Ligand binder design. Structure first.
Ligand SMILES: Cc1cccnc1NC(P(=O)(O)O)P(=O)(O)O
Ligand SMILES: Cc1cccnc1NC(P(=O)(O)O)P(=O)(O)O
Ligand SMILES: [Mg+2]
Ligand SMILES: [Mg+2]
Ligand SMILES: [Mg+2]
Ligand SMILES: [Mg+2]
Ligand SMILES: [Mg+2]
Ligand SMILES: [Mg+2]
Lengths: 359, 358
């Protein structure tokens, strides 16, 4: 039922967008066709956890009529959800190019589609981000919360890009970070710290994936200040670290057929939670071997790293992390429940879609 | 001296942005230092035609204390930097997309020795995000904020649509199908003046010409005072002409006054020369062109160039420039009538544009 409406508003947004191109940007049928397929492939097919969370938070918070408010709040909530989903899609397009990924949810990455050029794809991602602004101005022009909704959505958008910078520079010794001088992979790996990993992940995932759907849902239902923000943020940061940690773990141990891609972070020499947790507990013998084998397509060198990760019980460390998170999450949600029982419950519902996710 | 304050506010903008990163986004001196270089390299060293035009429009309009002047002109330099940062964002992405080698005589951002393409794509995105950040900082209490950012974004969006037109313009559009490959078009039935006009209008004209005038107007609190249909006609014609000039220079300006060796031939770009050549050419000429366009072999590239040379494209260009100058003159008068002050600032903008050497 949340799914049924979400999906109608998708059609609504697409129609306004594609038509506005036809009417005011002199676009031809062919490019409109190009763009409708780009939009569908890039924005549809996922679980819509971010987008659906807005609707769910908005519904929860209604309690504070023909049902005319209800109809308007829930429709705004779907628009907002699509804003966050189109933001994800923009990033996905750019991130797959940047991470030189091959597939995503069983389909070739967008820039790997037979008829999509690498150059057109960069600009396709840019289109996605702009559509967020376009749809928002179309639906919300006469909303009092406009300026505040967009101010936060743009801060979150920026935080995610800062996060991407962290991620994409966490393999070179930062003291040697310099545009005007060539530089290779950190052969010492001394920056692969839990501390630095938590920073990468807070900024690249947690803000847009966990804080923004909560905050947007609150805004459209006009309940932003009914909620302890500090505790809400603690939650989002914590749920968002765990999610990313899950992404990292699944990237190594989850079979392609369930992951939607032949996972590569090892290959990519990525600063993952597995890398860093391994490096901190690991012996000198283990560490040298790992250094000898991380960041290489060779099937046996990446399977060495996998044996090492197993040897060192990273799977059990994960069970231990997940358990700490769950209790930290339980305690925070109850502090929320005191004054925000409707909201705590929608966060619960978000935690449910996250904790031990199959994805 | 408009340049002097323009650079002062750049520092202010910079200082707020980098300090917000260390204070609120847990950044370290190394990445901050990387981001200061990136911001400098990509945002400075140009002519600042877009940015300075905002200031000039706002100066031309503060008659219709003597310290509202101070505030309106400070607003106007922020706006100018929003538009230059917007440019810079697109140059970062465009040079990767267009696979270019230098810009203004340095290696393009993504060719810098220790910048990856991977990181440069995201650098581009940082640029765009900064336009929003700087604006919320200086303008949050300013009542024109919603209108300013609304149009700014519309122009951003039009620039990106134009880039789509540019980048899909060497393939037959009937066959645009994400799921099937298709090589460069062998018939160029769509290198037309028509299609050229559309690329250029959206990708250049709006952010380069309209947006600087529009933002100057908004911080002057004088937008409804001008004939927008006319202002728009002007920006579109002025913008088309500029890009025509960009295309011609790409082929005929010697790398060193240009600041790069040109890419439009080898990319098989729908340039103004390509479409103006194709429209007047014999069939022999068309076949020779067809055997040589979208190629890096340097004597095919000087064949193509000699085809253009020997089809008199400079007389065609001189006649276009004259017909553009003439229509510019007319439109500036229709606008001078009710908006005397604004016309002048549009005329100064045209003066920075008409037969530009730099
Ligand atoms: C697409 C994206 C946005 C923000 C954070 N991560 C993202 N991608 C993930 P992917 O979905 O695993 O590519 P990664 O960070 O592992 O490349
Ligand atoms: C960067 C850019 C933005 C808008 C229009 N043109 C741009 N670049 C130009 P360049 O500056 O000539 O690369 P082109 O259109 O020829 O690639
Ligand atoms: Mg990534
Ligand atoms: Mg990726
Ligand atoms: Mg991953
Ligand atoms: Mg280009
Ligand atoms: Mg270029
Ligand atoms: Mg050019």
């Amino acid at each position: 039922m949340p799914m049924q409406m979400f999906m109608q508003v998708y059609d609504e947004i697409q129609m306004f967008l594609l038509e506005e191109l036809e009417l005011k940007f002199d676009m031809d049928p062919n490019r409109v066709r190009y763009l409708r397929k780009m939009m569908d492939t890039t924005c549809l097919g996922g679980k819509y956890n971010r987008g659906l969370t807005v609707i769910d938070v908005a519904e929860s918070l209604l309690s504070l009529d023909d049902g005319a408010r209800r109809k308007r709040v829930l429709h705004d909530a779907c628009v907002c959800g699509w804003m966050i989903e189109f933001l994800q899609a923009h990033y996905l397009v750019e991130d797959d190019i940047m991470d030189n990924s091959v597939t995503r949810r069983g389909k070739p990455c967008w820039y790997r589609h037979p008829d999509v050029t690498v150059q057109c794809a960069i600009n396709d991602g840019l289109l996605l981000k702009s559509w967020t602004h376009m749809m928002a101005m179309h639906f919300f022009a006469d909303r009092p919360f406009l300026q505040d909704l967009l101010c936060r959505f743009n801060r979150v958008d920026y935080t995610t890009a800062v996060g991407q910078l962290y991620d994409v520079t966490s393999m070179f010794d930062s003291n040697k970070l310099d545009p005007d001088v060539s530089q290779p992979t950190t052969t010492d790996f001394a920056e692969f710290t839990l501390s630095n990993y938590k920073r990468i992940v807070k900024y690249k995932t947690a803000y847009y994936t966990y804080l923004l759907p909560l905050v947007m849902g609150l805004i459209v239902s006009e309940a932003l200040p009914t909620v302890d923000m500090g505790v809400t943020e603690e939650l989002a940061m914590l749920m968002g670290e765990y999610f990313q940690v899950q992404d990292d773990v699944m990237d190594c141990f989850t079979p392609p057929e369930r992951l939607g891609k032949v996972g590569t972070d090892i290959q990519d020499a990525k600063c993952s939670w597995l890398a860093v947790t391994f490096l901190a507990k690991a012996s000198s013998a283990q560490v040298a071997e790992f250094k000898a084998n991380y960041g290489s397509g060779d099937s046996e060198k990446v399977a060495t790293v996998r044996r090492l990760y197993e040897e060192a019980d990273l799977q059990g460390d994960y069970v231990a992390y997940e358990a700490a998170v769950a209790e930290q999450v339980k305690e925070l949600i109850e502090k929320l429940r005191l004054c925000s029982p409707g909201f705590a419950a929608s966060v619960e519902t978000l935690w449910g879609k996250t904790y031990k996710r199959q994805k």
